[PDB]
Amino acid sequence: SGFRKMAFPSGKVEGCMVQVTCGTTTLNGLWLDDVVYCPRHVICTSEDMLNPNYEDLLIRKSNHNFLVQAGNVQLRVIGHSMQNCVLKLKVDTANPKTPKYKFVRIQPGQTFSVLACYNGSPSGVYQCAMRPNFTIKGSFLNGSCGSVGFNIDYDCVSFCYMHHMELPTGVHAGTDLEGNFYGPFVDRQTAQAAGTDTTITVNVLAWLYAAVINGDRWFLNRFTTTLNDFNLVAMKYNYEPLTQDHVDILGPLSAQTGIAVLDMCASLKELLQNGMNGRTILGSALLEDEFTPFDVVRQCSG
Amino acid sequence: SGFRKMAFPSGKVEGCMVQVTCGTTTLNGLWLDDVVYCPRHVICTSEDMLNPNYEDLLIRKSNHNFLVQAGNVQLRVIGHSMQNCVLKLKVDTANPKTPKYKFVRIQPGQTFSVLACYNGSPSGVYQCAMRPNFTIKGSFLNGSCGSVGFNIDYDCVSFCYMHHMELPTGVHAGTDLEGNFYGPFVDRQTAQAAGTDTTITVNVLAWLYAAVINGDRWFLNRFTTTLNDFNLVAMKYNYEPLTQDHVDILGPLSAQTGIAVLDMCASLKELLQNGMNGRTILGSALLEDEFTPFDVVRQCSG
Ligand SMILES: *[C@H](O)[C@H](C[C@@H]1CCNC1=O)NC(=O)[C@H](CC(C)C)NC(=O)OCc1ccccc1
Ligand SMILES: *[C@H](O)[C@H](C[C@@H]1CCNC1=O)NC(=O)[C@H](CC(C)C)NC(=O)OCc1ccccc1
Ligand SMILES: [Cl-]
Ligand SMILES: [Cl-]
Numbered sequence: 017s018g019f020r021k022m023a024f025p026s027g028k029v030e031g032c033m034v035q036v037t038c039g040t041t042t043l044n045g046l047w048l049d050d051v052v053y054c055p056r057h058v059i060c061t062s063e064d065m066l067n068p069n070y071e072d073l074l075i076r077k078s079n080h081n082f083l084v085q086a087g088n089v090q091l092r093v094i095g096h097s098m099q100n101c102v103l104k105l106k107v108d109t110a111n112p113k114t115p116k117y118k119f120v121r122i123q124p125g126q127t128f129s130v131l132a133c134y135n136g137s138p139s140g141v142y143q144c145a146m147r148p149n150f151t152i153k154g155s156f157l158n159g160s161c162g163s164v165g166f167n168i169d170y171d172c173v174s175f176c177y178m179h180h181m182e183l184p185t186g187v188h189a190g191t192d193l194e195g196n197f198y199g200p201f202v203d204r205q206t207a208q209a210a211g212t213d214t215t216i217t218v219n220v221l222a223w224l225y226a227a228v229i230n231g232d233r234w235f236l237n238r239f240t241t242t243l244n245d246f247n248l249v250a251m252k253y254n255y256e257p258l259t260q261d262h263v264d265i266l267g268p269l270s271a272q273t274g275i276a277v278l279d280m281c282a283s284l285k286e287l288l289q290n291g292m293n294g295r296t297i298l299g300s301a302l303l304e305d306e307f308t309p310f311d312v313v314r315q316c317s318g
Numbered sequence: 319s320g321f322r323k324m325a326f327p328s329g330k331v332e333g334c335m336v337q338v339t340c341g342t343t344t345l346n347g348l349w350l351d352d353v354v355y356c357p358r359h360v361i362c363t364s365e366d367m368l369n370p371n372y373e374d375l376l377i378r379k380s381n382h383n384f385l386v387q388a389g390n391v392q393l394r395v396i397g398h399s400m401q402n403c404v405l406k407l408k409v410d411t412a413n414p415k416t417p418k419y420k421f422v423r424i425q426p427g428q429t430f431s432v433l434a435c436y437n438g439s440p441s442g443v444y445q446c447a448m449r450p451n452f453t454i455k456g457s458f459l460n461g462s463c464g465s466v467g468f469n470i471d472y473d474c475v476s477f478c479y480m481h482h483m484e485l486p487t488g489v490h491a492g493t494d495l496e497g498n499f500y501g502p503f504v505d506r507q508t509a510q511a512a513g514t515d516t517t518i519t520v521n522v523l524a525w526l527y528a529a530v531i532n533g534d535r536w537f538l539n540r541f542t543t544t545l546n547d548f549n550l551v552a553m554k555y556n557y558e559p560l561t562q563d564h565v566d567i568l569g570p571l572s573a574q575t576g577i578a579v580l581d582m583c584a585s586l587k588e589l590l591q592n593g594m595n596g597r598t599i600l601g602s603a604l605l606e607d608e609f610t611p612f613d614v615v616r617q618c619s620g
């Protein structure tokens with residue numbers, strides 16, 4: 017038993033991380049088959065950061081302007097192109113360590129593992145959720161751009177995030193592997209601000225089921241509620257309304273514990289209204305909304 | 319910027335995990351050079367779990383009683399021996415994926431990455447601290463035994479934990495790679511109970527410095543205190559006394575922020591006495607003691 021924020025083993029992704037240099041600018045890239053993906057701000061000139069012309073800047077560059085480093089070995093760049101906010105660098109050598117992989121765009125509330133990297137070498141791995149305001153709360157310094165977020169099913173890697181930038185509030189923004197930003201942000205240093213965020217109601221319920229499964233049950237009541245009744249409380253405490261599909265994906269967790277989704281909603285309701293009586297749930301003194309229903313089934317069934 | 323519980327990339331350890339079967343009993347092993355380490359309770363007969371004679375049980379077993387599986391490939395067992403609570407299985411084939419590695423015994427308060435495994439295949443990675451009561455708060459089910467805890471420096475893996483058992487309170491116990499238990503526990507199903515735990519004062523201070531470095535500073539006061547004054551408060555709130563060596567290893571963090579160790583102690587003091595005013599520090603509503611001084615320097619300096 018026990019419940020901890022848990023990342024996926026990063027080995028299959030570590031064997032795809034390379035370093036990308038264009039000029040003075042260095043960051044990470046993702047070497048899959050004969051191609052290396054990295055953020056397109058790797059070609060920005062120092063003062064042309066406020067509003068860079070990426071089309072103009074990219075046609076200026078040869079294959080020779082891009083150094084692609086994979087240890088103490090230089091991969092050969094034989095083509096430079098752009099898709100949305102990601103460069104693609106064709107190389108003559110395919111990645112012998114290439115795994116079965118898809119590219120996927122995830123939804124707010126959904127989690128992925130981040131492999132934080134600097135100068136091409138993996139540094140640490142941690143779990144993130146895409147917030148409703150389309151940012152993540154990660155940990156990222158200068159050199160971290162090109163770090164990816166991913167999920168693993170069987171032997172297939174689902175890559176869903178590439179790191180680009182830090183917003184004033186200390187939160188992070190990036191795109192999918194097609195180079196499209198999550199949220200309303202752009203890859204220029206123009207003033208941008210994370211919108212107002214909300215609590216991922218379905219994920220809080222999932223985590224309360226994780227509690228019950230691990231014997232943390234002090235907060236369970238036997239009060240009735242309804243979807244409409246619960247949503248009136250949700251809205252008041254800055255929680256997303258619970259939808260019927262949200263109810264449906266908590267079906268597994270409801271089946272295993274014998275506690276109807278709406279019984280757990282009446283428990284979450286009393287927690288919102290009365291607080292936690294200076295107690296913890298799974299060692300947290302607040303309600304955790306960064307674990308999906310899937311995350312709980314996966315970790316409470318190995 | 320940003321601060322998250324962060325594990326080490328698990329790739330170098332993933333390439334050492336194998337499956338070990340003796341009879342009906344299966345669990346993980348650690349294939350380094352020509353040897354496979356696993357917990358010695360892998361040879362326990364079903365009813366001989368209360369007080370197993372491990373010396374008697376092990377001499378009963380051939381090399382042929384131990385199936386060692388590394389994918390869809392069976393490694394050849396050419397010798398069975400025991401060191402404390404770990405079996406060692408000699409194999410004819412050395413691990414081609416073997417990395418530069420030490421075995422180390424860590425101290426209470428110190429952190430490591432866990433690679434949770436089932437039937438030899440890595441499942442997830444997370445960060446743990448050895449508690450003062452010599453348990454860890456991990457996440458572990460049937461089949462997880464043989465999962466290891468590790469640290470990485472340069473290209474060298476420091477393996478410091480192997481998983482053995484779950485205590486009644488939902489907390490976990492294991493040994494070092496020499497097979498010696500952390501804490502007063504034994505690898506038999508006799509009644510054992512985690513002692514009383516305490517808060518790792520040096521790690522809370524480290525994490526408060528992590529806060530200040532990431533701009534979370536509402537809790538900083540300008541009150542004076544002394545080591546003796548602080549320890550009187552520490553003792554009252556079930557914190558370990560701060561020692562001069564604890565003061566010394568916070569030197570890096572004190573240098574970088576301009577805040578003397580004892581100034582931060584006066585801040586931790588007021589937090590203990592007055593609480594957190596329903597606020598968070600780095601997104602936690604309680605004081606986190608699972609990050610070492612080293613963990614903070616490493617993550618706030620990439
Ligand atoms: C990529 O390595 C780098 C990582 C950032 C900086 C430190 N922590 C991170 O996550 N990305 C950037 O530095 C980014 C570059 C632009 C070309 C996108 N700039 C940035 O993060 O700050 C931009 C900003 C300025 C003013 C308001 C809003 C955003
Ligand atoms: C190894 O795979 C297994 C994993 C445990 C069980 C579920 N979660 C875990 O972490 N280890 C054991 O099952 C262990 C076996 C003994 C031979 C050490 N037994 C156990 O964990 O419970 C023992 C116990 C009983 C009564 C009081 C105190 C401890
Ligand atoms: Cl694809
Ligand atoms: Cl590392």
Ligand SMILES: [Cl-]
Pocket residue numbers: 021022023141142143323324325444
């Ligand atoms: Cl994590």
Ligand SMILES: [Cl-]
Pocket residue numbers: 419420421
């Ligand atoms: Cl050694």
Ligand SMILES: [Cl-]
Pocket residue numbers: 024025168440441442
């Ligand atoms: Cl996996």
Ligand SMILES: [Cl-]
Pocket residue numbers: 021022023142323324325443444445
């Ligand atoms: Cl973690």
Ligand SMILES: [Mg+2]
Pocket residue numbers: 074096097098099
């Ligand atoms: Mg183009």
Ligand SMILES: [Mg+2]
Pocket residue numbers: 376398399400401
């Ligand atoms: Mg022996």
